[PDB]
């Protein structure tokens, strides 16, 4: 049995850690809601 606990406010924070790249990927979405790589 599942339960919820508050973790914080939803706010934009100035000067946050800027990381991660921006890749363009060819994907397919199936009926089970799972993505896969199309190549």
């Amino acid at each position: 049995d599942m339960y919820i606990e508050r973790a914080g406010d939803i706010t934009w924070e100035k000067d946050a850690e800027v990381t991660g790249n921006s890749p363009r990927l060819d994907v397919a979405l199936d009926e089970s809601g799972d993505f896969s790589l199309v190549e």
Binding site: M2, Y3, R6, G8, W12, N21, L29, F35
Partner: protein
């Protein structure tokens, strides 16, 4: 129970100790999370109970207490913030420029940040603090890393 707006952890005591299986957004009295986090099961909020209202396995989304309320969209140009809520760790904002998932039915924004599976449901925000989608449904690239879509529901 607690229905204040904000980000929340989704916990379970069924396994060893207390385990974080996901995260969610409380907005306008509705709890929003990813389908694979809860499988549509009822949730507990203190003494209160949250019952599922809408859900879809293909979109991988589910809402509790009412219809899906989140309807902001990524503008296709600006940086966003993943408000990551990792298991056992403090909520933390991570700024990134999203990539693109190209599909046969159009393009979707995608954030390339690798977090544990228990981080699923963590909101992705625009500069106004509005939730433009949830993190936790994507793909595993050649590197072994995870790249999640910016998954957004429909506000009826």
């Amino acid at each position: 129970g607690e229905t204040t707006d904000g980000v929340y952890r989704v916990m379970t005591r069924r396994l060893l100790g207390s385990t974080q299986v996901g995260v969610g957004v409380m907005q306008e009295g509705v709890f929003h999370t990813m389908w694979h986090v809860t499988k549509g099961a009822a949730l507990r909020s203190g003494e209160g109970r949250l019952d599922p209202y809408w859900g879809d396995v293909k979109q991988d989304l589910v809402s509790y207490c009412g219809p899906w309320k989140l309807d902001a969209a990524w503008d296709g140009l600006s940086e966003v913030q993943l408000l990551a809520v990792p298991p056992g760790e403090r909520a933390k904002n991570i700024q990134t420029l999203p990539g693109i998932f190209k599909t046969k039915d159009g393009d979707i924004g995608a954030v390339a940040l690798d977090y544990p599976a228990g981080t699923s449901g963590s909101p992705i925000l625009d500069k106004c603090g509005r939730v433009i989608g949830l993190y936790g449904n994507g793909v595993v690239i050649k590197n072994g890393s995870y790249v999640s879509a910016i998954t957004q529901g429909k506000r009826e």
